[PDB]
Design a protein around this ligand. Structure first.
Ligand SMILES: [Zn+2]
Lengths: 150, 108, 116, 42
């Protein structure tokens, strides 16, 4: 995974002067703390996650089905671990996780973070989601359990 | 060299950067400008233009003083509502030969 | 006489009514030679910086303003011989321009420059 | 700590704080004297 992050354009953006091997070092240091966070943070897209070698024959399986199966395992893990929106606002690294929170995704998540950022305030309570943001009752029903608040 | 105008920087780290002048001190000693920082904050040393944010910077350390939406740090880095308002030196900024495009109108 | 010519070419500014160029301390100490009864900028700096601007282009040293083409095109022919700016940027505040109109002086913009 | 082929290639390491931010990094580039100084700086 650190090789993948080292090669990723994201690492270039985050560390422009650092040599490639220095980028592996930070990714390894992040992975040991929490592989879920690092894996989700580097595997931004389908083209990225497919670079890891899960099985020698993975290139031959149907991509729509493989990607769905892998993201389903990410969704499961992110919902078991939960996501802290406050640290996601303060620290962009965790912003990747909400995409996998059930009931949410890129469109809804980026909107939610954009609002919370623009307001410059942490979520004091989960009721703040429907109060401050414009998310509907059913998505709130789905995701409220999986959203942590320190 | 008048307020509400558009100027560009020539020397220093702010190479070829488009900025805007908001207010000029009646003493004409220093001038206030709207700009985007290019420093690393002492972590890359032993970068492109992107908007400043006031929360990822407060953990590296240093003398940081926050009073709500107003922040002061690292040699009076005047800041308000997430934007920097520190003043520039007249020799480093060039006023003529800018001719701003629509993209600048959306940044500030 | 030479009291009207810049003492030093450091800190030069052009009056914004008559475009006469002098050093900041020359205006502050002696005042503007052509325009004093309608503006009254002698004895303070607040009025000086409100009306008078440092942002001017070129200088024309006018030796015989009475008999010169450059003096006509520039509307300085009835002024005293001295150094003038070719073009000064800015506009008077919304107080003296009204007072000037009230006193019968038609304030016309010294910003001769064409935009782009 | 990360590295490569090592044939005339250095070893790099980065200290990452609990929040995920990175601190100042260290470069670790007959052999006994060089390794001894590398060990000492480490
Ligand atoms: Zn005058």
């Amino acid at each position: 995974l650190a090789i993948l992050y080292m090669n990723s354009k994201k690492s270039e953006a985050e560390f422009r002067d650092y040599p490639p091997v220095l980028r592996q070092a930070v990714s390894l240091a992040r992975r040991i703390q929490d592989p879920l966070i690092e894996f989700a943070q580097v595997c931004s897209s389908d083209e990225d996650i497919l670079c890891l070698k899960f099985h020698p024959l993975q290139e031959h399986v149907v991509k729509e089905e493989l990607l769905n199966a892998l993201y389903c395992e990410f969704i499961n893990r992110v919902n078991e671990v939960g996501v802290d929106v406050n640290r996601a606002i303060a620290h962009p690294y965790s912003q990747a996780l909400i995409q996998y929170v059930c009931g949410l995704g890129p469109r809804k998540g980026t909107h939610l973070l954009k609002i919370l950022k623009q307001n410059n305030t942490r979520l004091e309570s989960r009721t703040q989601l429907v109060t401050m943001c414009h998310m509907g009752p059913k998505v709130f029903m789905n995701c409220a359990g999986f959203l942590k608040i320190d | 060299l008048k307020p509400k105008s558009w100027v560009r920087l020539k020397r220093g780290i702010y190479k070829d950067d488009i900025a805007q002048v908001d207010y000029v001190e009646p003493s004409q000693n220093t001038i206030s400008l709207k700009m985007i920082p290019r420093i690393d904050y002492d972590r890359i040393k032993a970068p492109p233009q992107r908007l400043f944010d006031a929360e990822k910077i407060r953990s590296l350390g240093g003398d940081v003083a926050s009073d709500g939406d107003f922040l002061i740090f690292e040699g009076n880095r005047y800041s308000r509502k997430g934007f920097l308002f520190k003043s520039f030196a007249m020799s480093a900024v060039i006023t003529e030969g800018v001719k701003p495009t629509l993209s600048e109108l959306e940044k500030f | 006489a030479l009291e009207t010519v810049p003492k030093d070419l450091r800190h030069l500014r052009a009056c914004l009514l008559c475009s006469l160029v002098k050093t900041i301390d020359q205006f502050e100490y002696d005042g503007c030679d052509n325009c004093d009864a309608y503006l009254q900028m002698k004895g303070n700096r607040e009025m000086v910086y409100d009306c008078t601007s440092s942002s001017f282009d070129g200088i024309i040293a006018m030796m015989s303003p009475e008999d010169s083409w450059v003096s006509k095109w520039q509307r300085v022919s009835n002024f005293k011989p001295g150094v003038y700016a070719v073009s000064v940027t800015g506009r008077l505040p919304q107080g003296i321009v009204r007072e000037l109109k009230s006193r019968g002086v038609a304030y016309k913009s010294r910003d001769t420059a064409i935009k782009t | 700590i990360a590295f490569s082929s090592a044939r005339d290639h250095p070893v790099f390491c980065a200290l990452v704080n609990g929040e995920g931010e990175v601190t100042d990094f260290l470069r670790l580039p007959e052999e006994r004297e060089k390794k001894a100084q590398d060990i000492e700086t480490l």
